[PDB]
Amino acid sequence: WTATSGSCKGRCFELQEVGPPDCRCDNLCKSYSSCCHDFDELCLKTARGWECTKDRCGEVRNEENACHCSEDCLSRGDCCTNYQVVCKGESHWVDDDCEEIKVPECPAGFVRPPLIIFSVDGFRASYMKKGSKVMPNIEKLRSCGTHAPYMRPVYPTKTFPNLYTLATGLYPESHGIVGNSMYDPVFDASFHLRGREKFNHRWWGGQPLWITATKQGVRAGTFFWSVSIPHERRILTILQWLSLPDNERPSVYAFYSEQPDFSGHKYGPFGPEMTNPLREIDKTVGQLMDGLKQLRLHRCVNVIFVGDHGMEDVTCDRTEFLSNYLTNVDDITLVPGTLGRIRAKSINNSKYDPKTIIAALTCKKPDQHFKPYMKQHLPKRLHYANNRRIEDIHLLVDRRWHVARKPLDVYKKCFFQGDHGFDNKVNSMQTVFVGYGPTFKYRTKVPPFENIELYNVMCDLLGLKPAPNNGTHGSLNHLLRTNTFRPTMPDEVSRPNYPGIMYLQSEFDLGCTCDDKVENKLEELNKRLHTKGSTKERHLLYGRPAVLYRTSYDILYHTDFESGYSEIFLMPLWTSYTISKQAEVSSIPEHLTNCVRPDVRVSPGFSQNCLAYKNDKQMSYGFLFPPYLSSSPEAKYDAFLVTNMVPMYPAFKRVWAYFQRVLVKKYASERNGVNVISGPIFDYNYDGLRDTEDEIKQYVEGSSIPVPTHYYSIITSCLDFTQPADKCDGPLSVSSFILPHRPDNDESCNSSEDESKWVEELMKMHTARVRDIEHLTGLDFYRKTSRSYSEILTLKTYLHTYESEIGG
Ligand SMILES: *[C@@H]1O[C@H](CO)[C@@H](O[C@@H]2O[C@H](CO)[C@@H](O[C@@H]3O[C@H](CO[C@H]4O[C@H](CO)[C@@H](O)[C@H](O[C@H]5O[C@H](CO)[C@@H](O)[C@H](O)[C@@H]5O[C@H]5O[C@H](CO)[C@@H](O)[C@H](O)[C@@H]5O)[C@@H]4O)[C@@H](O)[C@H](O)[C@@H]3O)[C@H](O)[C@H]2NC(C)=O)[C@H](O)[C@H]1NC(C)=O
Ligand SMILES: O=C(c1ccc2[nH]nnc2c1)N1C[C@H]2C[C@H](S(=O)(=O)CCc3cc(Cl)cc(Cl)c3)C[C@H]2C1
Ligand SMILES: [Ca+2]
Ligand SMILES: [Zn+2]
Ligand SMILES: [Zn+2]
């Protein structure tokens, strides 16, 4: 209940929210059904439209109009945004050639440039080019400001998770909003778009931009709006707020449009009906920019034009039904659409087995338009597992399709032609970023980037200190004219040992054999230089990674590779090696197939042993540096050391073998040599961060040898391919993957065929930022290049998507 007896007289869109049961007058009062009786009357005038006409000029102030053209309106700060235009012979902003804004040009009283966030729902990246002829204002912004060809949302590519990520720089797994619809099992409640649950503050984690602002002395406009409030009043309210006196005027503002998403669902991404929604948006933009020119703020304010996601062609008849795969279709709840999420209908059930549910859903029709995963097995770049609100069973749906439970749900719950929510790397989901203002750069294109990064930047524009988030602060410095944040490499925590020869063959009882006995001052002095690291600057191109936690490890040099070997985990943390274009693939000689040699630099006590592997019929082994790419038959023995060996399921070895034997050489040819760093990853609790010694859930049977949950490689080369990797002057180029270490190849439906038909496809799906691997390993790469640190942060955030050219 609320006594709505109070009044909004002079409180129209007040900024401090008063508490029940007195009536509110802010842009959220509607959604809580708690407005004062006169709110509609006083605060939402509509009379005479939103534009001045000639006859309206100089007029007599009438408080009933929606906006004014009366002489005193500039003073009152409430003119129609075109007042200067029709009444004062002034041109529109869109018509002025754009002048570089070399310094802020702000009126007396503005202690800092304000920031306006203009967010547009469902604004697909390719709109900027395709709809350009009917969006001149937005095309002005793009072309004079700083733009990216596209910006990448988070997964799921849905509205709530994506808007809240903009405001926090957090993955949904961390912020709490993992879907538009969610079930929390500790709350036993459901978050849906309709209804009032989504209002309880308990769903919303992280610290959003406006709280960050308040907590540090910067006042904020309120971000959310109410659906019935038209866009014109939304603009005029933002300009009114900007006319407030210095001590009350917010410094950060938000605008939001339901379009073009609302139509995209109706007409599809490119339906001819779409031109109007776009025309509208552009007009709204024009109205902000004209309004800011009226207030002398158009060369003072920084504007961010940003979308939350894109839009794909989707229709009813492209629905896949679980009822055609399952029998007990009724002992499951499904969260449907462009992503599936499954749980037991009741926890009263002990007969409920996910293993059989997954199997029932795996590669079961040749045509299949989805794929089941357990959430811990989803690609790590999706960062979609570490939250109780994410159900164990996830369905990745194909672009252009839906998953539903039964058919009844689709005709009784065709009307739509567009949707969104697919994998964040799918082209049609990409969205927009343009930045315009004094602090942004002038006529500047920047590379595509992930939206989790904007929070840091928006804090920079405000002089705020960003709350702990998932961006990599400094990775977007190249967007800005001048930045308050000069980033610095983290400090090495653990320094390495450099062990020489300290053990004799006979001290090792490891159960390994090797045919290596057949045995010169000139070529003995030589390989000594290899074990001290005389070819280290060939295989360690960017300096050694740093270890950012306390642990005991040894560096190990060889002719063809070099490693950081963990006495704790009994295997290397990283292994680094350069393969030049000219290098050639040889095969493992018949005699050395089962060769495993002790490493006389490392004690028997801190070594793996062949015995345990023999005893464990589930587990086999692999090597980090591949023997196939040894530079000489002699150097090859180096690859068989007990300290280059890692545990690997037979099924994984297939994957690994073909990566090592075929793809490395291929990349080396296409890229002009590559530098490869490879290693294990342990993330048993799937939080995207390295596990500690005492969080290991799986050892090789009868040993203290941990089993990785994943395998990574980082493949680097010269961005200019005419330069070999090992002699690169300028910028670098990189691609990486985090491969799940799994005992079967159920993920690949063509897996019984030749590796050449399915392995590279899997690797692609599990593409990765170097930054993701840093979280998962606790290492820090690229410590010694010729490149600026900011450039190196940009590079560690890059993700190679394997999607073709945006637009067509
Ligand atoms: C992306 O970036 C984030 C932020 O930097 C990283 O997540 C941080 O990781 C660390 C280590 O795991 C956590 O530290 C622990 O924190 C607790 C106390 O923390 C409390 O207070 C903080 C800060 O005020 C608060 O954010 C936490 O709130 C969580 O839990 C709420 C429910 O109880 C929930 O409403 C909220 O959304 C948030 O939930 C998520 O995080 C928790 C982690 O605690 C997780 O269990 C849950 O599933 C959600 O994902 C919390 O009450 C200390 O006592 C511990 O000792 C420990 O140091 C930070 O809490 C955590 N911060 C956030 C915001 O999640 C991610 O690791 C990073 N991802 C990657 C891949 O790098
Ligand atoms: O109906 C939809 C909607 C939109 C599309 C869809 N597709 N499929 N289903 C969809 C449903 N909606 C109404 C809601 C209110 C807005 S809001 O005004 O609260 C966001 C303002 C804001 C801006 C920033 Cl920058 C950050 C944050 Cl956190 C919030 C969010 C919601 C969308
Ligand atoms: Ca972990
Ligand atoms: Zn949206
Ligand atoms: Zn939508």
Side-chain angles (χ1 to χ4, degrees), residues 97-134:
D97 316 317
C98 67
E99 300 285 356
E100 178 159 35
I101 309 168
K102 302 181 191 180
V103 299
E105 295 174 26
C106 295
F110 282 73
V111 89
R112 59 167 75 70
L115 170 68
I116 291 177
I117 297 142
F118 198 108
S119 60
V120 278
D121 208 329
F123 202 98
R124 188 173 161 154
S126 45
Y127 293 161
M128 291 302 300
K129 199 153 299 149
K130 294 168 90 60
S132 82
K133 252 77 155 146
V134 303

mmCIF file of all heavy atoms in Angstrom, residues 97-134:
data_model
loop_
_atom_site.group_PDB
_atom_site.id
_atom_site.type_symbol
_atom_site.label_atom_id
_atom_site.label_comp_id
_atom_site.label_asym_id
_atom_site.label_seq_id
_atom_site.Cartn_x
_atom_site.Cartn_y
_atom_site.Cartn_z
ATOM 1 N N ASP A 97 30.057 21.147 -40.077
ATOM 2 C CA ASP A 97 31.270 20.337 -40.293
ATOM 3 C C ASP A 97 31.873 20.089 -38.932
ATOM 4 O O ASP A 97 31.770 20.948 -38.058
ATOM 5 C CB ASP A 97 32.327 21.077 -41.114
ATOM 6 C CG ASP A 97 31.761 21.800 -42.306
ATOM 7 O OD1 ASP A 97 30.899 21.245 -43.023
ATOM 8 O OD2 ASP A 97 32.210 22.933 -42.534
ATOM 9 N N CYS A 98 32.508 18.942 -38.722
ATOM 10 C CA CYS A 98 32.998 18.680 -37.379
ATOM 11 C C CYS A 98 34.422 19.149 -37.172
ATOM 12 O O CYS A 98 35.308 18.875 -37.970
ATOM 13 C CB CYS A 98 32.807 17.230 -36.969
ATOM 14 S SG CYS A 98 33.788 16.022 -37.871
ATOM 15 N N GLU A 99 34.615 19.884 -36.088
ATOM 16 C CA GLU A 99 35.911 20.451 -35.763
ATOM 17 C C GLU A 99 36.498 19.600 -34.671
ATOM 18 O O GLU A 99 35.825 19.315 -33.692
ATOM 19 C CB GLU A 99 35.767 21.887 -35.229
ATOM 20 C CG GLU A 99 35.110 22.895 -36.168
ATOM 21 C CD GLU A 99 36.009 23.349 -37.314
ATOM 22 O OE1 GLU A 99 37.207 22.952 -37.366
ATOM 23 O OE2 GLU A 99 35.505 24.121 -38.170
ATOM 24 N N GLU A 100 37.747 19.197 -34.832
ATOM 25 C CA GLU A 100 38.458 18.545 -33.753
ATOM 26 C C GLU A 100 38.204 19.283 -32.446
ATOM 27 O O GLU A 100 38.276 20.511 -32.412
ATOM 28 C CB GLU A 100 39.951 18.538 -34.040
ATOM 29 C CG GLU A 100 40.726 17.904 -32.909
ATOM 30 C CD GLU A 100 42.084 17.414 -33.310
ATOM 31 O OE1 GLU A 100 42.728 18.063 -34.157
ATOM 32 O OE2 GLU A 100 42.509 16.372 -32.764
ATOM 33 N N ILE A 101 37.888 18.543 -31.384
ATOM 34 C CA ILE A 101 37.751 19.128 -30.057
ATOM 35 C C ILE A 101 39.037 18.921 -29.258
ATOM 36 O O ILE A 101 39.119 18.004 -28.467
ATOM 37 C CB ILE A 101 36.580 18.493 -29.276
ATOM 38 C CG1 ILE A 101 35.293 18.509 -30.102
ATOM 39 C CG2 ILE A 101 36.374 19.191 -27.932
ATOM 40 C CD1 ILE A 101 34.201 17.651 -29.509
ATOM 41 N N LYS A 102 40.031 19.785 -29.455
ATOM 42 C CA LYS A 102 41.357 19.637 -28.823
ATOM 43 C C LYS A 102 41.379 19.822 -27.303
ATOM 44 O O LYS A 102 42.220 19.245 -26.628
ATOM 45 C CB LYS A 102 42.385 20.559 -29.486
ATOM 46 C CG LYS A 102 42.546 20.305 -30.975
ATOM 47 C CD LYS A 102 43.574 21.209 -31.629
ATOM 48 C CE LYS A 102 43.474 21.092 -33.142
ATOM 49 N NZ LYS A 102 44.479 21.967 -33.800
ATOM 50 N N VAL A 103 40.473 20.635 -26.771
ATOM 51 C CA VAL A 103 40.326 20.793 -25.315
ATOM 52 C C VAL A 103 38.836 20.870 -24.980
ATOM 53 O O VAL A 103 38.029 21.238 -25.843
ATOM 54 C CB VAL A 103 41.031 22.076 -24.771
ATOM 55 C CG1 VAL A 103 42.541 22.059 -25.047
ATOM 56 C CG2 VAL A 103 40.374 23.351 -25.307
ATOM 57 N N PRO A 104 38.453 20.535 -23.735
ATOM 58 C CA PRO A 104 37.058 20.751 -23.365
ATOM 59 C C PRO A 104 36.697 22.227 -23.477
ATOM 60 O O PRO A 104 37.521 23.088 -23.136
ATOM 61 C CB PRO A 104 37.018 20.336 -21.897
ATOM 62 C CG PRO A 104 38.159 19.396 -21.731
ATOM 63 C CD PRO A 104 39.229 19.936 -22.636
ATOM 64 N N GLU A 105 35.491 22.513 -23.974
ATOM 65 C CA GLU A 105 34.943 23.871 -24.017
ATOM 66 C C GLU A 105 33.671 23.898 -23.183
ATOM 67 O O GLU A 105 32.572 23.792 -23.717
ATOM 68 C CB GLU A 105 34.655 24.296 -25.446
ATOM 69 C CG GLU A 105 35.892 24.409 -26.314
ATOM 70 C CD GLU A 105 35.579 24.683 -27.776
ATOM 71 O OE1 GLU A 105 34.505 25.257 -28.066
ATOM 72 O OE2 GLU A 105 36.413 24.331 -28.643
ATOM 73 N N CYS A 106 33.838 24.017 -21.867
ATOM 74 C CA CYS A 106 32.736 23.921 -20.901
ATOM 75 C C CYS A 106 32.438 25.285 -20.296
ATOM 76 O O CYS A 106 33.363 26.082 -20.119
ATOM 77 C CB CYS A 106 33.087 22.943 -19.777
ATOM 78 S SG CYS A 106 33.288 21.215 -20.286
ATOM 79 N N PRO A 107 31.150 25.560 -19.986
ATOM 80 C CA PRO A 107 30.739 26.794 -19.303
ATOM 81 C C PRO A 107 31.161 26.827 -17.840
ATOM 82 O O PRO A 107 31.363 25.769 -17.221
ATOM 83 C CB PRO A 107 29.210 26.761 -19.396
ATOM 84 C CG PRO A 107 28.927 25.852 -20.545
ATOM 85 C CD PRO A 107 29.982 24.794 -20.445
ATOM 86 N N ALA A 108 31.292 28.039 -17.304
ATOM 87 C CA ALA A 108 31.645 28.249 -15.894
ATOM 88 C C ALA A 108 30.819 27.351 -14.981
ATOM 89 O O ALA A 108 29.581 27.316 -15.079
ATOM 90 C CB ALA A 108 31.432 29.705 -15.513
ATOM 91 N N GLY A 109 31.499 26.618 -14.108
ATOM 92 C CA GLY A 109 30.810 25.770 -13.133
ATOM 93 C C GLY A 109 30.937 24.268 -13.357
ATOM 94 O O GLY A 109 30.609 23.471 -12.475
ATOM 95 N N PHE A 110 31.411 23.872 -14.535
ATOM 96 C CA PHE A 110 31.515 22.454 -14.849
ATOM 97 C C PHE A 110 32.891 21.934 -14.462
ATOM 98 O O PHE A 110 33.866 22.111 -15.202
ATOM 99 C CB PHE A 110 31.173 22.197 -16.323
ATOM 100 C CG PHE A 110 29.694 22.218 -16.611
ATOM 101 C CD1 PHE A 110 28.984 23.421 -16.619
ATOM 102 C CD2 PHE A 110 29.007 21.040 -16.859
ATOM 103 C CE1 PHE A 110 27.623 23.450 -16.877
ATOM 104 C CE2 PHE A 110 27.645 21.063 -17.120
ATOM 105 C CZ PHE A 110 26.950 22.270 -17.127
ATOM 106 N N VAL A 111 32.958 21.302 -13.288
ATOM 107 C CA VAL A 111 34.233 20.859 -12.695
ATOM 108 C C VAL A 111 34.896 19.689 -13.465
ATOM 109 O O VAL A 111 36.046 19.339 -13.195
ATOM 110 C CB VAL A 111 34.075 20.573 -11.168
ATOM 111 C CG1 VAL A 111 33.663 19.129 -10.889
ATOM 112 C CG2 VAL A 111 35.343 20.939 -10.400
ATOM 113 N N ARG A 112 34.150 19.126 -14.426
ATOM 114 C CA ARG A 112 34.546 17.992 -15.275
ATOM 115 C C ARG A 112 33.528 17.805 -16.422
ATOM 116 O O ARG A 112 32.337 18.084 -16.237
ATOM 117 C CB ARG A 112 34.636 16.702 -14.450
ATOM 118 C CG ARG A 112 33.329 16.310 -13.766
ATOM 119 C CD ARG A 112 33.327 14.888 -13.212
ATOM 120 N NE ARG A 112 34.122 14.757 -11.993
ATOM 121 C CZ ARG A 112 33.792 15.269 -10.805
ATOM 122 N NH1 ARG A 112 32.676 15.971 -10.651
ATOM 123 N NH2 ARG A 112 34.593 15.085 -9.763
ATOM 124 N N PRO A 113 33.981 17.318 -17.608
ATOM 125 C CA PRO A 113 33.038 16.962 -18.705
ATOM 126 C C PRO A 113 32.031 15.876 -18.285
ATOM 127 O O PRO A 113 32.435 14.825 -17.808
ATOM 128 C CB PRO A 113 33.958 16.408 -19.793
ATOM 129 C CG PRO A 113 35.311 16.965 -19.486
ATOM 130 C CD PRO A 113 35.383 17.062 -17.993
ATOM 131 N N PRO A 114 30.722 16.130 -18.436
ATOM 132 C CA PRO A 114 29.771 15.072 -18.096
ATOM 133 C C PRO A 114 29.807 13.936 -19.117
ATOM 134 O O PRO A 114 30.292 14.127 -20.243
ATOM 135 C CB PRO A 114 28.410 15.779 -18.148
ATOM 136 C CG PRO A 114 28.693 17.215 -18.241
ATOM 137 C CD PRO A 114 30.034 17.351 -18.872
ATOM 138 N N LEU A 115 29.305 12.765 -18.731
ATOM 139 C CA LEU A 115 29.268 11.622 -19.648
ATOM 140 C C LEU A 115 27.835 11.188 -19.878
ATOM 141 O O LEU A 115 27.107 10.905 -18.916
ATOM 142 C CB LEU A 115 30.100 10.455 -19.112
ATOM 143 C CG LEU A 115 29.953 9.126 -19.856
ATOM 144 C CD1 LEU A 115 30.551 9.219 -21.247
ATOM 145 C CD2 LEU A 115 30.627 8.019 -19.057
ATOM 146 N N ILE A 116 27.428 11.162 -21.144
ATOM 147 C CA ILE A 116 26.108 10.651 -21.497
ATOM 148 C C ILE A 116 26.166 9.281 -22.211
ATOM 149 O O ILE A 116 26.793 9.121 -23.276
ATOM 150 C CB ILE A 116 25.325 11.660 -22.348
ATOM 151 C CG1 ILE A 116 24.949 12.863 -21.493
ATOM 152 C CG2 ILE A 116 24.063 11.013 -22.899
ATOM 153 C CD1 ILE A 116 24.236 13.946 -22.266
ATOM 154 N N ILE A 117 25.510 8.299 -21.623
ATOM 155 C CA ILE A 117 25.448 6.996 -22.256
ATOM 156 C C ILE A 117 24.133 6.823 -23.016
ATOM 157 O O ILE A 117 23.067 6.690 -22.404
ATOM 158 C CB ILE A 117 25.640 5.861 -21.239
ATOM 159 C CG1 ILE A 117 27.036 5.983 -20.637
ATOM 160 C CG2 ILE A 117 25.397 4.501 -21.902
ATOM 161 C CD1 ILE A 117 27.077 5.645 -19.172
ATOM 162 N N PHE A 118 24.227 6.828 -24.343
ATOM 163 C CA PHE A 118 23.080 6.598 -25.203
ATOM 164 C C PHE A 118 23.033 5.129 -25.622
ATOM 165 O O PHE A 118 23.726 4.726 -26.553
ATOM 166 C CB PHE A 118 23.205 7.479 -26.442
ATOM 167 C CG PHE A 118 21.922 7.657 -27.180
ATOM 168 C CD1 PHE A 118 21.259 8.868 -27.142
ATOM 169 C CD2 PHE A 118 21.370 6.604 -27.916
ATOM 170 C CE1 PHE A 118 20.063 9.029 -27.824
ATOM 171 C CE2 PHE A 118 20.178 6.758 -28.604
ATOM 172 C CZ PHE A 118 19.530 7.971 -28.557
ATOM 173 N N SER A 119 22.239 4.316 -24.939
ATOM 174 C CA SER A 119 22.243 2.888 -25.230
ATOM 175 C C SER A 119 21.068 2.513 -26.107
ATOM 176 O O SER A 119 19.937 2.935 -25.858
ATOM 177 C CB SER A 119 22.190 2.072 -23.952
ATOM 178 O OG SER A 119 21.018 2.403 -23.260
ATOM 179 N N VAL A 120 21.347 1.712 -27.127
ATOM 180 C CA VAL A 120 20.322 1.272 -28.048
ATOM 181 C C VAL A 120 20.207 -0.255 -28.078
ATOM 182 O O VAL A 120 21.194 -0.954 -28.316
ATOM 183 C CB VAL A 120 20.609 1.827 -29.429
ATOM 184 C CG1 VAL A 120 20.092 3.246 -29.522
ATOM 185 C CG2 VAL A 120 22.104 1.807 -29.680
ATOM 186 N N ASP A 121 19.002 -0.761 -27.816
ATOM 187 C CA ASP A 121 18.758 -2.194 -27.698
ATOM 188 C C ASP A 121 18.709 -2.819 -29.083
ATOM 189 O O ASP A 121 18.101 -2.270 -30.009
ATOM 190 C CB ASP A 121 17.444 -2.467 -26.967
ATOM 191 C CG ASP A 121 17.445 -3.799 -26.237
ATOM 192 O OD1 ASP A 121 18.132 -4.756 -26.710
ATOM 193 O OD2 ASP A 121 16.760 -3.891 -25.180
ATOM 194 N N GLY A 122 19.366 -3.971 -29.213
ATOM 195 C CA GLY A 122 19.394 -4.744 -30.445
ATOM 196 C C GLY A 122 20.071 -4.056 -31.616
ATOM 197 O O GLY A 122 19.814 -4.413 -32.765
ATOM 198 N N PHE A 123 20.921 -3.068 -31.349
ATOM 199 C CA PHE A 123 21.573 -2.357 -32.443
ATOM 200 C C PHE A 123 22.728 -3.207 -32.956
ATOM 201 O O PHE A 123 23.843 -3.147 -32.439
ATOM 202 C CB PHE A 123 22.048 -0.959 -32.014
ATOM 203 C CG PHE A 123 22.239 0.010 -33.164
ATOM 204 C CD1 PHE A 123 21.246 0.939 -33.488
ATOM 205 C CD2 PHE A 123 23.406 0.014 -33.897
ATOM 206 C CE1 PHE A 123 21.417 1.844 -34.529
ATOM 207 C CE2 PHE A 123 23.590 0.916 -34.936
ATOM 208 C CZ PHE A 123 22.591 1.829 -35.256
ATOM 209 N N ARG A 124 22.420 -4.014 -33.966
ATOM 210 C CA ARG A 124 23.375 -4.878 -34.664
ATOM 211 C C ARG A 124 24.512 -4.059 -35.247
ATOM 212 O O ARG A 124 24.281 -2.978 -35.761
ATOM 213 C CB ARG A 124 22.654 -5.635 -35.786
ATOM 214 C CG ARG A 124 23.508 -6.705 -36.443
ATOM 215 C CD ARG A 124 22.722 -7.552 -37.419
ATOM 216 N NE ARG A 124 23.637 -8.233 -38.332
ATOM 217 C CZ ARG A 124 23.373 -9.380 -38.955
ATOM 218 N NH1 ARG A 124 22.212 -10.030 -38.787
ATOM 219 N NH2 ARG A 124 24.294 -9.882 -39.751
ATOM 220 N N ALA A 125 25.733 -4.581 -35.176
ATOM 221 C CA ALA A 125 26.908 -3.861 -35.685
ATOM 222 C C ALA A 125 26.794 -3.393 -37.119
ATOM 223 O O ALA A 125 27.163 -2.264 -37.421
ATOM 224 C CB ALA A 125 28.170 -4.695 -35.519
ATOM 225 N N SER A 126 26.294 -4.252 -38.004
ATOM 226 C CA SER A 126 26.229 -3.949 -39.456
ATOM 227 C C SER A 126 25.242 -2.843 -39.850
ATOM 228 O O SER A 126 25.304 -2.337 -40.981
ATOM 229 C CB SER A 126 25.956 -5.218 -40.269
ATOM 230 O OG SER A 126 24.926 -5.996 -39.670
ATOM 231 N N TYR A 127 24.342 -2.464 -38.931
ATOM 232 C CA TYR A 127 23.514 -1.244 -39.116
ATOM 233 C C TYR A 127 24.301 0.013 -39.428
ATOM 234 O O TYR A 127 23.882 0.777 -40.279
ATOM 235 C CB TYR A 127 22.584 -0.962 -37.940
ATOM 236 C CG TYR A 127 21.491 -1.990 -37.764
ATOM 237 C CD1 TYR A 127 20.826 -2.107 -36.548
ATOM 238 C CD2 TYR A 127 21.108 -2.841 -38.813
ATOM 239 C CE1 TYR A 127 19.829 -3.058 -36.350
ATOM 240 C CE2 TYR A 127 20.105 -3.794 -38.626
ATOM 241 C CZ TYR A 127 19.467 -3.887 -37.387
ATOM 242 O OH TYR A 127 18.479 -4.802 -37.165
ATOM 243 N N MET A 128 25.450 0.210 -38.774
ATOM 244 C CA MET A 128 26.250 1.435 -38.969
ATOM 245 C C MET A 128 26.583 1.685 -40.424
ATOM 246 O O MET A 128 26.626 2.828 -40.882
ATOM 247 C CB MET A 128 27.543 1.415 -38.151
ATOM 248 C CG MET A 128 27.345 1.527 -36.646
ATOM 249 S SD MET A 128 26.476 3.004 -36.072
ATOM 250 C CE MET A 128 27.575 4.261 -36.693
ATOM 251 N N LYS A 129 26.819 0.611 -41.157
ATOM 252 C CA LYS A 129 27.166 0.756 -42.555
ATOM 253 C C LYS A 129 25.891 0.737 -43.385
ATOM 254 O O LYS A 129 25.671 1.615 -44.209
ATOM 255 C CB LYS A 129 28.123 -0.356 -42.980
ATOM 256 C CG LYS A 129 28.893 -0.054 -44.253
ATOM 257 C CD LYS A 129 30.213 -0.813 -44.260
ATOM 258 C CE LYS A 129 31.086 -0.393 -43.078
ATOM 259 N NZ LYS A 129 31.955 -1.494 -42.579
ATOM 260 N N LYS A 130 25.046 -0.256 -43.119
ATOM 261 C CA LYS A 130 23.909 -0.563 -43.976
ATOM 262 C C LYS A 130 22.816 0.510 -43.895
ATOM 263 O O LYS A 130 22.263 0.913 -44.917
ATOM 264 C CB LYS A 130 23.390 -1.990 -43.698
ATOM 265 C CG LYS A 130 24.407 -3.059 -44.103
ATOM 266 C CD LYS A 130 24.086 -4.454 -43.589
ATOM 267 C CE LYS A 130 23.219 -5.228 -44.567
ATOM 268 N NZ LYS A 130 23.898 -5.395 -45.882
ATOM 269 N N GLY A 131 22.546 1.002 -42.695
ATOM 270 C CA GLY A 131 21.512 2.006 -42.506
ATOM 271 C C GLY A 131 22.068 3.415 -42.482
ATOM 272 O O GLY A 131 21.382 4.347 -42.063
ATOM 273 N N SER A 132 23.304 3.588 -42.943
ATOM 274 C CA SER A 132 23.985 4.871 -42.772
ATOM 275 C C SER A 132 23.270 6.045 -43.450
ATOM 276 O O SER A 132 23.251 7.146 -42.898
ATOM 277 C CB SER A 132 25.447 4.788 -43.203
ATOM 278 O OG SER A 132 25.562 4.917 -44.594
ATOM 279 N N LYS A 133 22.686 5.791 -44.624
ATOM 280 C CA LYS A 133 21.973 6.796 -45.422
ATOM 281 C C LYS A 133 20.739 7.388 -44.758
ATOM 282 O O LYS A 133 20.145 8.320 -45.281
ATOM 283 C CB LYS A 133 21.528 6.198 -46.760
ATOM 284 C CG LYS A 133 22.283 6.667 -47.986
ATOM 285 C CD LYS A 133 23.639 5.994 -48.068
ATOM 286 C CE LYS A 133 24.139 5.936 -49.504
ATOM 287 N NZ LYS A 133 25.622 6.088 -49.531
ATOM 288 N N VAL A 134 20.329 6.849 -43.623
ATOM 289 C CA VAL A 134 19.129 7.345 -42.968
ATOM 290 C C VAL A 134 19.365 7.619 -41.493
ATOM 291 O O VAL A 134 18.421 7.724 -40.710
ATOM 292 C CB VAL A 134 17.940 6.384 -43.172
ATOM 293 C CG1 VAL A 134 17.692 6.186 -44.661
ATOM 294 C CG2 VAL A 134 18.174 5.048 -42.483
#
